[PDB]
Amino acid sequence: MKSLQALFGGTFDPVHYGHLKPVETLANLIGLTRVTIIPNNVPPHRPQPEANSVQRKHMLELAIADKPLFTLDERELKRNAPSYTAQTLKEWRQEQGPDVPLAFIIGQDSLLTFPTWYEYETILDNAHLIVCRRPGYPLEMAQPQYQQWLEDHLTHNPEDLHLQPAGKIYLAETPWFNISATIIRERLQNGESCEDLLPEPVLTYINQQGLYR
């Protein structure tokens, strides 16, 4: 089969170390050679990112410039019909073929309520789920009924991600960081230092552009 490809989505407002460092460690932990970040927008009916689509795309390219592991796909930022993880992954499966292992990266917090921002059954049909560990969190769904789904799909063997196309859920022992885009925005507006929270090229860019004012 082909080389595993992982997909990493989100709004990245802005991208920061809490998003990047855990994922970078996957190259070492499970032999992941490629991660494609697919940033998205937020539907009009929900709180909007403070930085726009082009600013958030640029900050991600700044953060990713010197990291060969990463590439960026700007489709969800160009699509007019609402974005859905399952919709992205279905297009990916189509574009890559059924012979390519595919994985979606998520945090251990989101895993627990996965069926809520669902299409879960469809996602595990199209790709694997690579879960970035949250020290101290349990592997127990918010909805006690989905515990079965979760337990049937889990794997303790990283090799399954490389030998099958989709269907598995693996908890990677990635480092974790107490950093959040929301607090960084607040600190930037409060004039507090964010030097230890995201890449210098992104922070410098933020200042040049006068973002998060």
Pair 110, 117: CB distance under 8 Å? yes
Cβ nearer to ligand [Xe], comparing 4 with 37: 37
Nearer of residues 5 and 108 to ligand [Xe], judged by Cβ: 5
* Residue 203 in contact with ligand [Xe], rule: CB under 6 A: no
Q: Which amino acid is it at 93?
A: R
Nearest residue to ligand [Xe], scored by beta-carbon proximity = 9
Q: What does residue 135 show for φ and ψ, rounded to 5 degrees?
A: -40, 130
Q: Residue 14, preceding bond cis, omega within 30 degrees? A: yes
Cα separation, 206 vs 51, in Å, equals 10
Provide, rounded to whole angstroms, the least separation between the CB of residue 144 and ligand [Xe]: 27
| One residue of 4, 6, 15, 171 binding ligand [Xe] per CB under 6 A | 15
Residue 7 sits in the site that holds ligand [Xe] (CB under 6 A): yes
Binding segment toward ligand [Xe], per CB under 6 A, in 13-21, 116-124, 166-174, 180-188: 13-21
72 CB-near residues (< 8 Å, 6+ apart): 36, 37, 38, 39, 57, 60, 61, 64
Binding site for ligand [Xe] (CB under 6 A): 7, 9, 15, 19-20, 37-38, 63, 85, 88, 104
